[PDB]
Structures are given as structure tokens and as C-alpha cells.
Design a protein around this ligand. Structure first.
Ligand SMILES: Cc1cc2nc3c(=O)[nH]c(=O)nc-3n(C[C@H](O)[C@H](O)[C@H](O)COP(=O)(O)O)c2cc1C
Ligand code: SF4
Ligand code: SF4
Ligand code: SF4
Ligand code: SF4
Ligand code: FES
Ligand code: FES
Ligand SMILES: [Zn+2]
Lengths: 426, 88, 23, 78, 210, 27, 263, 83, 106
């Protein structure tokens, strides 16, 4: 439900206030049962996540255990690998920036705890190129850990071998995709591959590979070291566990709090963070999972709590759980319009739907903000939207269509008036 | 842009096609009502005078006028020419 | 921080890294 | 890349003189059977027609592409 | 996306990794599996950018040589990513985040202030070559929606006057306290932490026999 | 708001072929 | 017998494991409309003009890259797989420059046909088109690349048949331009094949620029005499002078390709 | 000689045609008339060229006057546009 | 108006001309542009059906309002590109009025 206890808050060093470095980490006791866990077995680790029923902490939601289970199949003579994507291009995902800037070890032991679960030879962490600062913090942390012998061959005084590496991103949101990151590592252009060859079977350097949101890798060790069931209790049904929530825009105290999942949307701005700037009635709309997920208008805001099942009932996605809030002084139409501008400046262009479709919606959306376009065009953008939604090679085209669909779904009268406003002044 | 059609005809004529096929089993090789709602009784060449006489002089099927007689030539078919008699 | 510090950390963690497989 | 024009057997005749009309520079010809491309549906039915009409034939066997195995992942190996 | 050879930006310019740089080069490679030096392109191309911001056609060709890859390969990587600059950026490249999260926090409000202070249009270098302003997209520090990235400095919660203090510090002197401004630090509920105030539970706590 | 100017056709085509011009001096 | 059984609108054909959904339709005889998929070129999935709907399945799959599985019935003429083509063709055409009476791949266009058979009667793009900058790739290939549908066939051929990796994609977004970043001519034998392999008329042949138009060309099948491989070729003659020689497929000798010399 | 050559060689017997007659030859060569036209300066990177008309001119194509190095020429009007 | 021939040698007007009357062999005109070197009607084969004026995407070939052009000989009816272009350099004051008069209905 809500009011996650500090005693249950995984990322204790959030907000810093501790030594993100190892000695702070030791007081955190992050490396407490690592040898034991690995000793227990890879099968024991996946039992822990299956019991946890953790969902993907990245924009896509899938059982974390089943995804890791897939490349637990016997090696075919190719080294298995771990890829941690610290890229978070999605607006409002400062969620991950926290775990690299702070509590970097949380992720380092997440990597080896996760590594033996998939039997990965090594893990590469792709941080956003922008986070040069963040990249500096982690390898200082990674360097500490090996010096200790926590990672490396015979890591944590155990038979198992692991090596952790950090890879420089280069300002691309699409590099965040499950497969495209792999291609970026491989050194080719960051263009996603098709799903038929699933990442596990075909991978980074053509070997089995797996990709996890940094939050997903980070919570593993604590979910196993601590009781996974313990975590499970926090979640709701399929939904489970605490996921960091970032609230940004039109709220009195924008902040990232790792409060519990399944939180009433009205409650998290009202109780933690900062109540919606201007009052809870000054809420034109809420973007729950970030730019990719459709915004939900106030009417439904207070009604649904934050969890992926509840949101999909609501037609929106928990995604990165980045809450972007809009007051009534905003231009709903120009707000979403810049997100389509966010996607035309960013989609790879590999696939026909997304390439021309996202540019086509950008042109129509800019006209919509001006009000130059006629009212009949508004549903035509509906139809352009679903052509892009099911036909794209990756999910970004999936993502571009949803905000457009949300604007037409709940704010169709406002766009018509902008249509009307321009027609009147001629 | 989809023809205004009557299904009554397809059925009525289909039924006549079975009638003609039953009345003349010896000469008719295939009867089919096309989707243009027209009927085509394909007869063995020997049935040319029998089949047309039955249609010209039968109370339940009087086909008094010969609209036209023409011969499509499909060179592939062994019997190239396909004489076609349209009756009203 | 400086432009070359991130890569110098990599320069440093080379030894830390054990050997890499070859295809 | 349309394969709908490579499915029916054609019987075309030899290419004789195509010359130039002195007055306007157009292409002129005296081969009455020049624009002739009969279309059959099988080798058997074309040889039959040519033999039927007394022409000489030069049958050329069909050349369907063989099956070439294609896989997306293959280009990701190393 | 076409490199029309120009005297300044052309193959003529000689590029070569400093003895120190070449060292760095190797470090990167080994990170990748053997015989996969190809992957080194992005990280290496980055060090060519570290060496020189311009990174001219000559520099890319050099990268291809070092990693043994086909030049076109490197050219494709450089063009795809915004991080690499194929033109001479200014000494201080100021990038203002203008995605919707920041906009709603008047990120644009920052823009107008910076254009006037730099006294220049958005997208080009100052005559002084001192600063270069560009309207970059989300930088991943949405919590502090007002935000500008100055050569990694990554400042935040910036207000016209805040940027004012910052731009003056860059123009005279250096290292202008890069980071948030209001003192909200990184993602602190401004009013109060509201959480994590309780002391760390300590190692072992909650193990619950896993 | 007999005549000499009679249209006469051409072959406006640029002659579409070129014959070898034999060598000018013998061998 | 590792044949696996899969249904093409019911014909229930049996195919080797690992055949693509597009390939399964071919043996029944159906043709998936396709761009960016060439039989002897790697599958890329760029166009996604081949989206089909396997049965009782949530979304449309790419017939060029999806390995057909056991007992999936492909529905190639469903109400969905036509909205998956009526809506893609909307996009390819949206940024396309209307100069079909300039594009000498007039009747030789795999993009007007598929528009003219599987695409849409009208246009809804009431906005502004894009334009790219014509560059010089050589004296044999005229790249009026504002025509390009970014299908990456050229990039692959240049890299998988001819080993000349000079061509490549540059830039992201709608701005992706498929060409040679620096202006270096595409000099190699096997060069002219790009013309034949680009279904769009973006880059076409410069000598045969505007001498003819394909419906007129009478096509006589003959043999290559310039080189001893004896590559099969089709000589396209109009009113009695040869206008172009393009390859005709011989599995064993020239499988759809001919030399720069003999063209 | 027509704008496209065609001039008969003195020996050509194909010259009798014009005896007691003459030769229909247009004096207004479009190679030059189009050169006697001002390069259309523009502000935008890309420009249209409906052929100076909507439905009375030529199909509408957008030309990329992006390089001053080259004045885009609509393939239909032969009009050069000066960025 | 500028003076540039409108015909860009599409061959969209002999592919429809049912009387098979038109031969428009073309080249690049040495400006880099695209124009005819050849154009033709045999006016003793044409049927005045106007399938060439409605197919032309540029309004180059039209079918003017002349009907007093009888000839004492057969050769004066095989029009060339220069008896059609100066012909069109004659009636353009009289054609365009009728095009502008009927363009909407077409
Ligand atoms: C355009 C695009 C951008 C993405 N960016 C990110 C990202 O920045 N971080 C991330 O964790 N996942 C991102 N994803 C989702 C990944 O494809 C993948 O599903 C996810 O990283 C898996 O993490 P999880 O399984 O631990 O949730 C992105 C997906 C798309 C289509
Ligand atoms: S390619 Fe040439 S022909 Fe095919 S559509 Fe585009 S323009 Fe018309
Ligand atoms: S050029 Fe022809 S082939 Fe190369 S991409 Fe553009 S269209 Fe596809
Ligand atoms: S006349 Fe009109 S149609 Fe005939 S070629 Fe010239 S332009 Fe194309
Ligand atoms: S009018 Fe004369 S020329 Fe124009 S199409 Fe009909 S017949 Fe051919
Ligand atoms: S939008 Fe500027 S911080 Fe993400
Ligand atoms: S043809 Fe299937 S992906 Fe383009
Ligand atoms: Zn024009």
C-alpha cells in the first residue's frame, strides 16, 4: 500500500548522507551475505526472485525471474554475459541516476549476485554519456571492490569468476533499448534488432546476453540477502516490491522517494514529495511512467494507485514510474508536442513506421498547438498513431503513439477549441 | 463502389442451373452461377442442338432469342475455341 | 573532475580485469 | 522484385529486321509475326501448338530460384 | 550529414593520439573481448573528442586505423550520436535541457536569460568562442528541471540569476561550483527528506535466512 | 480580345550510330 | 523429416525449420509485399511493409525475419494485414518526392505497384515534404537520393556481394541519409547492380538516364560475351537499337548480377 | 539546325525534301530562354516548385537549396534557385 | 512562361495513345535537364481523343481549338516537335484561356 518503512527502504543511501564509497557501504552492510548467496547456488538465487515475483524496474514490465531464467540454459561454448543499462533517456528517470551517484556498490554486488544467477562471465554497465560525473563515481566504487577482491576471479572468496566494466553512452535515448544497447556495445550504430533472435540466444558479441534496468540488478542482492518474500509482501498481487518514484513538474517539492508501490496517486504528491503545486485541483493531468506512458487526467488520478496492473487497467503504463505533473496553467497540447519533438530528434530511423510517422505527428502536433489545423485532423492523428503503435521494430514507436493517444482520449475538447480559436481570428 | 446486387437472382438462377443439369444429364459438364449473377451451362459439343432446343422450347425455361454466338480462342487448351451462345 | 579521469580509471582497472576470451 | 510475370510459358518468334523509315525516322518492319507472344500454361501445351502450326521450337526449361535459407540472427554472429 | 572537405576541417589536418592518449586507447580495447577491437569505436571516438572537440574527418579516419575498422563504420557512429561534435564547439559548450519536464519548470525561462548573457543566438559559439549554447534534450536530471550542462558540469535548479552567477564565474575564473544551486542537492524533497532519516539498519539486518 | 512554306518532316534523332571512318593514309 | 507444418491461409504447407514467414507464403504461392528484403541479401526488417498476422496472435510479425513456428496459420489477406500495409504505404509515400515522370524507374517501381495494389487510394499528408542533397557516387550511378526509402539494400549489397564498404547510413531520425559520408565515388565492379537492386529510382543509371521507359522496351534474353563467366543477361531493345542490358537470373552462372563492363 | 541538331549533311539526299519548300524549325530554344531567367533566391532550406501554379503547373516537388554550391533545379522547370 | 519546354519526356502519352501515334525519344539536353530530342504525332493516325492532354502531368501536350489545318499532302500531317512547339508558340494566348476556363472541371 503505502508509507514504506525506512526499515524496508532498500536504497538507504539515497540522497547521499552516507559514504557512497565502500566504507559507507560496509556500514550499510551491502556486502554481508554475498559469499553465502553465491554458494547456495544459481538455482537458489532464481528461486528467490521467482518467490519475489519482481517485475522489470525499467519501462517494460516482465517477470524479472523468468527473464533471467531464460539464459540459465546450459552454455553452448560461448561465454554468457550481463549487460546493465544505466542509460535512462526517458524524461523523469533521474530514478537510476541516484544509484550510480550514490550507493554504487549496491549495483556492483547486484551485478555479481545477478551474474551467478545467469552464470555470466562478465557484466558491462552502459551509463549515459551525459553522466560523466556518475561514470567517475562507479569505477572508483568498482576499483574499491576488486582491491577488496569482492569482484574479479574467485570473487568474494568463491569458485565463481566475474569482471564488471563501464561503457560510455553517447547521448542516445534509443541506446536504452534492450537490443540497441547491445549494438552500441558491439560498436555499430545504435539501431535495435528484431526480436526473433532473442537477446539471450544471440548477443553482445554474439553470445548469450541479458539486459536489466540498474534498479533491477541493484535490488537482487538485497532481495536474496534479505527475504525475497519479505519484499513480495510489499507488492500487490503480480505487482510487488518498492520501486523508486520520481515526481517532477508542478509539485511543491519534486524528489525521488523509494516509497512503496501500489501508492494512491493522490497520496504520493499529497503525503511525500510535494503536494501538487497550486493545489490538488490544479492538476490538468499526470504522466505516471514518464514520456512513453499516456498521461491520465485528474479525474482518474486520485482513483488509481501506482502499480503496473492498476495502470494497464487505466490504459497507462507504470514504466519508469516517473510522475510528471501538469497544472491548469499548462498547454497540454504544446507539452505533448515537445515529447513528439523529443522523439523526432531521437528515433533511429531504421524502421519506416517510426521514421516518417513520428515526424508526421510532429508536424501535425506543431500545427495543433498553433490551432492552424482543422478539427477533422485530430482523429486522423488518431489513425496515424495506431499505424505506428503495432508496426514498429522496437517499442519507441510504441512509446511515441501513446502520448498522442492520451491527448486525443481525454483532452479532445481543448484541442478542438485551439482549432476554433485560430479559425475565428482568421 | 460495390455493385448494388440482388441475392434473389443468384439463388433463383442457381436453382435453374441445377434444374437444367438434372433435365439434361448427358450433355452438361459443368454449371455455375458466376458472381456477376449470370448463369453458364457448359455442354459437351454434341449437346449443342439438344441443350439449346430444350431451352428454346420448354415451358419452365423459354429462351427464345439468341443474343450472340462467339468463340474465345484460348490457344493453350487442347480444344482451343470455346464457342459461347448467350440466350435471352 | 577532468576529461581524461574516467578513462584513466579504466587504465587503472585493467589489471583488475582478468583475461578476456578470444573467438 | 515481382514474380507474377514469370509464371506462364510464352511462345515468341524470331527477331527479324527492324529498320528506319526514311521520311520520319520511325522504326519499320516487314515481319508480320513480330509482335506475336502467345501465352500458354505449360511446356506440354506450347510444344503442342508449335508442332500443330508447323513452326520450329527451341524450348528453354524454367529457372525457379532454388530455396536459399535466410536467418535474421546470422548476421549477429562474430 | 556530408563532410565537404574544408581547409580547417579536412583530411589535411594531422590527428594522432598523444603518447598518453594511445595508452588510454589500449586500456579500452582490452575491456572488450579479444578480436573485438571494433567495439572500441565509441569509447575511442570519445577520446578523440576528449583530445579535440572539433574531431575533424582526419580524426575519424585515424580512429578507423587504430581500431582497424572501415572508416565508414566510424563515420556512421560519429553521425548517429549527438555526444560527438563534427564541428568546432566552443570552449564551454552550454547545453540547456528543454524536454517537457524542464519546460514546465520554466527551463525555457532559463534559455532567454542565457541567450542575453552570452549575447548570442541559440545554437552557435560566442564570437569569443568562449561559450556555445545548444538546446539539448532530456539530460536525466529532471528532478531539478531547470538545468544546463556545461562540459560535464551539469548544473541544476537554475534560475536566471543562478545562471547569472554561473556564467560570470565561467567568464572570469573557473570551476564555478558545478552542481545544484538551491541546496536541494540531488533529488531531496525540498521541504524535507521525509524518509531515510532513520539510521541505517546495519549489515545482517533483515537477512531472514534469505 | 505552290507556297514554299510547307511543313516537311525530319528524323530529329542525332543519327544513333557511328561508322568506322577508314584510315586516311595508306600503310 | 524435420519438416515442420505451417498454414498459409489454410494450404497447410510443410516447411524446413528456419524458413521465414515470407518464405512460407512463397511455396503456397502468395507474395508478401516487400521492400528491404532481397533473396541473396541479409534480412534487415527496415521497411516493415511485410507485416502479416499469424493466427490468434496479438501483433503483426515481419515476414522477413520471423522464423515460422509449428502450426501458425499465416493470414496474408486479413483485414489486419491490409491495414498494416495501407498504413505503411501511407508513410513511405508521405516523404516521397512526386517526380514519377522524372523517375526513370517509372514502370520499374516496386513502390508504385505495391501502392497501386496494396496501398491507399488517397493521401492524408497535408504537411511539408523533406529533400536530401544529390551527391556524386560515380559516372555510372545517378543518385537522385531524395527518392530513397532508407531500405538499406544498397548498404548491404555494397558490403556483402561487393566487398566495398564505402556506402553507409549517416544520421538518425527522419534525417537518416544513406550515402558516403565524404564524397568518394563507389568505384568497384558489380557497382551497377545497386541500380537494379534499389527498388526506388533514387540512384539509377546515368547513361540510361532518360532514353526510354520500360513498357516500350522489348526484352530479348541473351548471353554475356564481354567476360568468360558467360553471365545470363536481358538486352532491352526499343525500335531496333539496344537501350540497356540488365541481368536475368541463372542460379549457377550469374545469380541476378552482371559486371560493370557488360552493362 | 534544330535545338537538337538534326542538320542534314550537305550530301544527304534527305535534303530534297526542302526544295521548293523550307524547314520547320523553332527559333526559341529552351536551353537559352531558361538561362535568361533570374535564379529564384529563397530563405528556406527547402522550397517548393508547383511550376508557378496550382493544377495549372507541374507536379509539386520540394527542392533542397541547401548548398549555395548548387542552385537546386526543379527537374520539371529547369529553374535554378539561389538559396 | 519562362520559355522552357514543359514536356519532360515521360512517355505517359504514347503508352495511352490508342492509335499508337507518338514517338518521343529523349536525352539529357546537356544542361543536365530532361527534355525531348524527339516528339511526334502522325496526325493521320490520331483520333482527337484528348487522352494525351489529360494524362500529361505538366500540361505540355494539349489539343488546341484549330480545325482549319487541312493540307494538300501527306507529309504536312506528320507533325514533329517543332511544328507542335511553334504551333504552341502560336495559340498560347488562345489555349490558356480555355485551360483556365476548364481547369476546375478537370
Ligand atoms: C526507445 C527506448 C528507450 C529505452 N530506454 C531505456 C533506458 O534508458 N533504461 C532502461 O532501463 N530501459 C530502457 N528501455 C527498455 C529496454 O528496452 C529494456 O526493456 C529494459 O532496459 C529492460 O530492463 P528490465 O528488464 O530490468 O526492466 C528502452 C526501450 C526503448 C524502446
Ligand atoms: S520511385 Fe520514382 S517512380 Fe517509384 S514512385 Fe518514387 S518517383 Fe514515382
Ligand atoms: S538507395 Fe535504393 S537501396 Fe539504398 S536505401 Fe535508398 S532505396 Fe534502399
Ligand atoms: S507531353 Fe506531357 S506527357 Fe507526353 S511526354 Fe511530354 S510531358 Fe510526358
Ligand atoms: S489525341 Fe491523338 S495523340 Fe493524343 S492520344 Fe488521342 S490519339 Fe494519341
Ligand atoms: S527533461 Fe531536462 S532533465 Fe529530463
Ligand atoms: S520486407 Fe519484411 S522487413 Fe521490409
Ligand atoms: Zn518547377
Amino acid at each position: 500500500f503505502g508509507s514504506l518503512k525506512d526499515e524496508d527502504r532498500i536504497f538507504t543511501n539515497l540522497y547521499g548522507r552516507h559514504d557512497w564509497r565502500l566504507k559507507g557501504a560496509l556500514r550499510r552492510g551491502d556486502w554481508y551475505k554475498t559469499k553465502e548467496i553465491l554458494l547456495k547456488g544459481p538455482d537458489w538465487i532464481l528461486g528467490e526472485m521467482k518467490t519475489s515475483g519482481l517485475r522489470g524496474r525499467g519501462g517494460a514490465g516482465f517477470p524479472t525471474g523468468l527473464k533471467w531464467s531464460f539464459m540459465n540454459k546450459p552454455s553452448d561454448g560461448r561465454p554468457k554475459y550481463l549487460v546493465v543499462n544505466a542509460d535512462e533517456g526517458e524524461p523523469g528517470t533521474c530514478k537510476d541516476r541516484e544509484i550510480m551517484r550514490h550507493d554504487p556498490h549496491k549495483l556492483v554486488e547486484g551485478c555479481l549476485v545477478g551474474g551467478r544467477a545467469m552464470g555470466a562471465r562478465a557484466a558491462y554497465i552502459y551509463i549515459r554519456g551525459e553522466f560523466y560525473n556518475e561514470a567517475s563515481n562507479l569505477q572508483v566504487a568498482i576499483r574499491e571492490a576488486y582491491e577488496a577482491g569482492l569482484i574479479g576471479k574467485n570473487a568474494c572468496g568463491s569458485d565463481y569468476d566475474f569482471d564488471v566494466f563501464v561503457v560510455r553512452g553517447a547521448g542516445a535515448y534509443i541506446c536504452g533499448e534492450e537490443t540497441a544497447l547491445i549494438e552500441s556495445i558491439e560498436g555499430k550504430q545504435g539501431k535495435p534488432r528484431l526480436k526473433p533472435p532473442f537477446p539471450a540466444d544471440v548477443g553482445v558479441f554474439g553470445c548469450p546476453t541479458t539486459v536489466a534496468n540498474v534498479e533491477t540488478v541493484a535490488v537482487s542482492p538485497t532481495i536474496c540477502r534479505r527475504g525475497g518474500t519479505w519484499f513480495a509482501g510489499f507488492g500487490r498481487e503480480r505487482n510487488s516490491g518498492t520501486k523508486l518514484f520520481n515526481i517532477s513538474g508542478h509539485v511543491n517539492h519534486p524528489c525521488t522517494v523509494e516509497e512503496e508501490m501500489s501508492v494512491p496517486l493522490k497520496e504520493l504528491i499529497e503525503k511525500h514529495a510535494g503536494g501538487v503545486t497550486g493545489g490538488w485541483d490544479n492538476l490538468l493531468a499526470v504522466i505516471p511512467g514518464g514520456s512513453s506512458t499516456p498521461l491520465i487526467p485528474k479525474s482518474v488520478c486520485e482513483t488509481v494507485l501506482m502499480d503496473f496492473d492498476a495502470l494497464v487497467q487505466a490504459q497507462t503504463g507504470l514504466g519508469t514510474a516517473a510522475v510528471i505533473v501538469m497544472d491548469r496553467s499548462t498547454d497540454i497540447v504544446k507539452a505533448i508536442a515537445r515529447l513528439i519533438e523529443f522523439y523526432k530528434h531521437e528515433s533511429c530511423g531504421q524502421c519506416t513506421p517510426c521514421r516518417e510517422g513520428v515526424d508526421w505527428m510532429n508536424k501535425v502536433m506543431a500545427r495543433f498547438v498553433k490551432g492552424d489545423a482543422r478539427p477533422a485532423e485530430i482523429d486522423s492523428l488518431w489513425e496515424i498513431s495506431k499505424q505506428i503503435e503495432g508496426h514498429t521494430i522496437c517499442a519507441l514507436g510504441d512509446g511515441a503513439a501513446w502520448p498522442v493517444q492520451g491527448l486525443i482520449r481525454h483532452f479532445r475538447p481543448e484541442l478542438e477549441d485551439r482549432m476554433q480559436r485560430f479559425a475565428q481570428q482568421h | 463502389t460495390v455493385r448494388p446486387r440482388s441475392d434473389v437472382t443468384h439463388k433463383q438462377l442457381s436453382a435453374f442451373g441445377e434444374y437444367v443439369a438434372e433435365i439434361l444429364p448427358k450433355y452438361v459438364q459443368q454449371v455455375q452461377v458466376s458472381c456477376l449473377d449470370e448463369l453458364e451451362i457448359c455442354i459437351h459439343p454434341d449437346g449443342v442442338i439438344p441443350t439449346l432446343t430444350f431451352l428454346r422450347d420448354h415451358t419452365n425455361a423459354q429462351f427464345k432469342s439468341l443474343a450472340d454466338l462467339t468463340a474465345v480462342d484460348v490457344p493453350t487448351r487442347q480444344n482451343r475455341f470455346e464457342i459461347v451462345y448467350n440466350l435471352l | 573532475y577532468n576529461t581524461y579521469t574516467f578513462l584513466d580509471l579504466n587504465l587503472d582497472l585493467s589489471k583488475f580485469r582478468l583475461p578476456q576470451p578470444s573467438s | 522484385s515481382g514474380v507474377n510475370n514469370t509464371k506462364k510459358w510464352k511462345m515468341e518468334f524470331d527477331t527479324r529486321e527492324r529498320w528506319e523509315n526514311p521520311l520520319m525516322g520511325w522504326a519499320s518492319t516487314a515481319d508480320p509475326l513480330s509482335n506475336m507472344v502467345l501465352t500458354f500454361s505449360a511446356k506440354e501445351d506450347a510444344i503442342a501448338f508449335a508442332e500443330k502450326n508447323g513452326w520450329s521450337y527451341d524450348v528453354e526449361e524454367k529457372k525457379v530460384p532454388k530455396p536459399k535459407s535466410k536467418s535474421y540472427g546470422a548476421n549477429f554472429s562474430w | 550529414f556530408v563532410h565537404r572537405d574544408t581547409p580547417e576541417n579536412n583530411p589535411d589536418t594531422p590527428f594522432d593520439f598523444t603518447p598518453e592518449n594511445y595508452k588510454r586507447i589500449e586500456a579500452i580495447v582490452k575491456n572488450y573481448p579479444e578480436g573485438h577491437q571494433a567495439a572500441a569505436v565509441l569509447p575511442v571516438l570519445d577520446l578523440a573528442q576528449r583530445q579535440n572537440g572539433w574531431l575533424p574527418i582526419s580524426a575519424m579516419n585515424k580512429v578507423a586505423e587504430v581500431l582497424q575498422v572501415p572508416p565508414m563504420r566510424v563515420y556512421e557512429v560519429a553521425t548517429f550520436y549527438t555526444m560527438y561534435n563534427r564541428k568546432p564547439v566552443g570552449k564551454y559548450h552550454i547545453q540547456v535541457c528543454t524536454t517537457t519536464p524542464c519546460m514546465l519548470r520554466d527551463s525555457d525561462s532559463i534559455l532567454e536569460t542565457l541567450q542575453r548573457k552570452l549575447g548570442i543566438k541559440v545554437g552557435e559559439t560566442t564570437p569569443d568562442k568562449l561559450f556555445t549554447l545548444i538546446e539539448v534534450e532530456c539530460l536525466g536530471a529532471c528532478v531539478n528541471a531547470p538545468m544546463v550542462q556545461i562540459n560535464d558540469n551539469y548544473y541544476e535548479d537554475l534560475t536566471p540569476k543562478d545562471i547569472e552567477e554561473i556564467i560570470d564565474e565561467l567568464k572570469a575564473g573557473k570551476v564555478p561550483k558545478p552542481g545544484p544551486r538551491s541546496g536541494r542537492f540531488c533529488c531531496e524533497p525540498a521541504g524535507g527528506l521525509t524518509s531515510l532519516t532513520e539510521p541505517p539498519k546495519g549489515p545482517g539486518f533483515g537477512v531472514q535466512a534469505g | 480580345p505552290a507556297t514554299p512554306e510547307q511543313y516537311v518532316p525530319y528524323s530529329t534523332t542525332r543519327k544513333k550510330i557511328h561508322e568506322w571512318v577508314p584510315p586516311s593514309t595508306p600503310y | 523429416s524435420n519438416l515442420i507444418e505451417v498454414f498459409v491461409d489454410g494450404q497447410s504447407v510443410m516447411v524446413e525449420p528456419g524458413t521465414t514467414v515470407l518464405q512460407a507464403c512463397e511455396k503456397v504461392g502468395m507474395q508478401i509485399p516487400r521492400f528491404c528484403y532481397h533473396e541473396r541479401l541479409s534480412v534487415a526488417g527496415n521497411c516493415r511493409m511485410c507485416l502479416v498476422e499469424i493466427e490468434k496472435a496479438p501483433k503483426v510479425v515481419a515476414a522477413c525475419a520471423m522464423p515460422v513456428m509449428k502450426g501458425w496459420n499465416i493470414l496474408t489477406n486479413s483485414e489486419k494485414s491490409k491495414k498494416a500495409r495501407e498504413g505503411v504505404m501511407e508513410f513511405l509515400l508521405a516523404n516521397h518526392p512526386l517526380d514519377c515522370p522524372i523517375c526513370d524507374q517509372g514502370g520499374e517501381c516496386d513502390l508504385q505497384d505495391q501502392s497501386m495494389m496494396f496501398g491507399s487510394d488517397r493521401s492524408r499528408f497535408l504537411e511539408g515534404k523533406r529533400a536530401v542533397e544529390d551527391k556524386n557516387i560515380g559516372p555510372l550511378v545517378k543518385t537522385i537520393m531524395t527518392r530513397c526509402i532508407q531500405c538499406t539494400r544498397c548498404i548491404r549489397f555494397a558490403s556483402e556481394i561487393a566487398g566495398v564498404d564505402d556506402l553507409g547510413t549517416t544520421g538518425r531520425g527522419n534525417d537518416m541519409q544513406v550515402g558516403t559520408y565524404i564524397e568518394k565515388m563507389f568505384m568497384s565492379e558489380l557497382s551497377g547492380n545497386v541500380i537494379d537492386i534499389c527498388p526506388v529510382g533514387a540512384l539509377t543509371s546515368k547513361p540510361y538516364a532518360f532514353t526510354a521507359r520500360p513498357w516500350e522496351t522489348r526484352k530479348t534474353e541473351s548471353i554475356d560475351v564481354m567476360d568468360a563467366v558467360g553471365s545470363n543477361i536481358v538486352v532491352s531493345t526499343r525500335t531496333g537499337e539496344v537501350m540497356r542490358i540488365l541481368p536475368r537470373m541463372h542460379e549457377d552462372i550469374n545469380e541476378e548480377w552482371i559486371s560493370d563492363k557488360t552493362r | 539546325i534544330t535545338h537538337t541538331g538534326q542538320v542534314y549533311d550537305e550530301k544527304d539526299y534527305r535534303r530534297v525534301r526542302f526544295v521548293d519548300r523550307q524547314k520547320e524549325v523553332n527559333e526559341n530554344f529552351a536551353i537559352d530562354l531558361i538561362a535568361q531567367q533570374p535564379v529564384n533566391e529563397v530563405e528556406h532550406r527547402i522550397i517548393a516548385c508547383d511550376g508557378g501554379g496550382g493544377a495549372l503547373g507541374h507536379p509539386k516537388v520540394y527542392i533542397n537549396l541547401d548548398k549555395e554550391t548548387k542552385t537546386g533545379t526543379c527537374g520539371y522547370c529547369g529553374l535554378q534557385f539561389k538559396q | 512562361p519562362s520559355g522552357e519546354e514543359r514536356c519532360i519526356a515521360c512517355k505517359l502519352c504514347e503508352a495511352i495513345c490508342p492509335a499508337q501515334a507518338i514517338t518521343i525519344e529523349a536525352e539529357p539536353r546537356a544542361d543536365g535537364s530532361r527534355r525531348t530530342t524527339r516528339y511526334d504525332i502522325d496526325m493521320t493516325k490520331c483520333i482527337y481523343c484528348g487522352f494525351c492532354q489529360e494524362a500529361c502531368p505538366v500540361d505540355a501536350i494539349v489539343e488546341g481549338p484549330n480545325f482549319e489545318f487541312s493540307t494538300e499532302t501527306h507529309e504536312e500531317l506528320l507533325y514533329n516537335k517543332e511544328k507542335l512547339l511553334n504551333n504552341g508558340d502560336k495559340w498560347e494566348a488562345e489555349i490558356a484561356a480555355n485551360i483556365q476556363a476548364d481547369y476546375l472541371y478537370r
